[PDB]
Design a binder for this molecule. Sequence first.
Ligand code: ZN
Ligand code: ZN
Ligand code: ZN
Ligand code: ZN
Ligand code: ZN
Length: 303
Amino acid sequence: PIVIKFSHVVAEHTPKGQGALLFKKLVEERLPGKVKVEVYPNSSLFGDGKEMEALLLGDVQIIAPSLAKFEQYTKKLQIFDLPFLFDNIQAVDRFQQSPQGKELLTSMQDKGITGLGYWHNGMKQLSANKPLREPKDARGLKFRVQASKVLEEQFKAVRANPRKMSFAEVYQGLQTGVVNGTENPWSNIYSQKMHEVQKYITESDHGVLDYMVITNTKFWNGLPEDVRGVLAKTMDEVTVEVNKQAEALNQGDKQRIVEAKTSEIIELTPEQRAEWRKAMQPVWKKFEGEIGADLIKAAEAAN
Ligand SMILES: [Zn+2]
Ligand SMILES: [Zn+2]
Ligand SMILES: [Zn+2]
Ligand SMILES: [Zn+2]
Ligand SMILES: [Zn+2]
């Protein structure tokens, strides 16, 4: 059979982990003996920084990186990293589905990559070993970020010291004090046990963690036309399922963190959240030139 390896860096009981397994389940039912899907979670095949290499060589067929991890291949996806750009997952969804949002799926056409769809995870929450209620609370802390210039600027804006790290290394980074805070949707906190080394989690919803499911164009366009049709339709069905259940998964993980009895959850007043917004929103100006001032304008319209 045609082998499709789906590699990713998250745990199985997460939006992306379930999505990859659902894709395997449906494809193997619909193309019996014609296509086999092998899923490699938790960086078990390829980890951060290395997966793009594998995809373009042909060592893996589908990956789904965070939208924040494409700056070296395109400058447009950085729009999803801008803090407080989207108020909720609804706005995110509306932008992704617009003509401009869909054109971004081909933003890496030149580099031999085909965008198959957007998968949601959820809004990011701040965590640290001290309560983060107001921007000043972050001063002097070391925060792990994904490999994004936008996210680095976000923390520099609150006088924190950002450190780019691969996802697989974050728990150890926090436990050893190399970093002392980070940002993550609830599901990544719980599934990587980061609540065990982060005493305070602030429900900031200050940015979005979402993915682009991608493949190698030469591989994908090289498939038998009939097989590709079924795979594309099946991926679209999986996207629906992932996206409808992501928020609920994250809420389940928030509750599992509460039940774990390791951390305290800080709720922000609308006013406190407005303070974070005022401190971080100036980062948008630094990236308008690369992203496109008009592209950013449309994203606001989605709100
Ligand atoms: Zn379950
Ligand atoms: Zn959606
Ligand atoms: Zn850095
Ligand atoms: Zn379902
Ligand atoms: Zn759950």
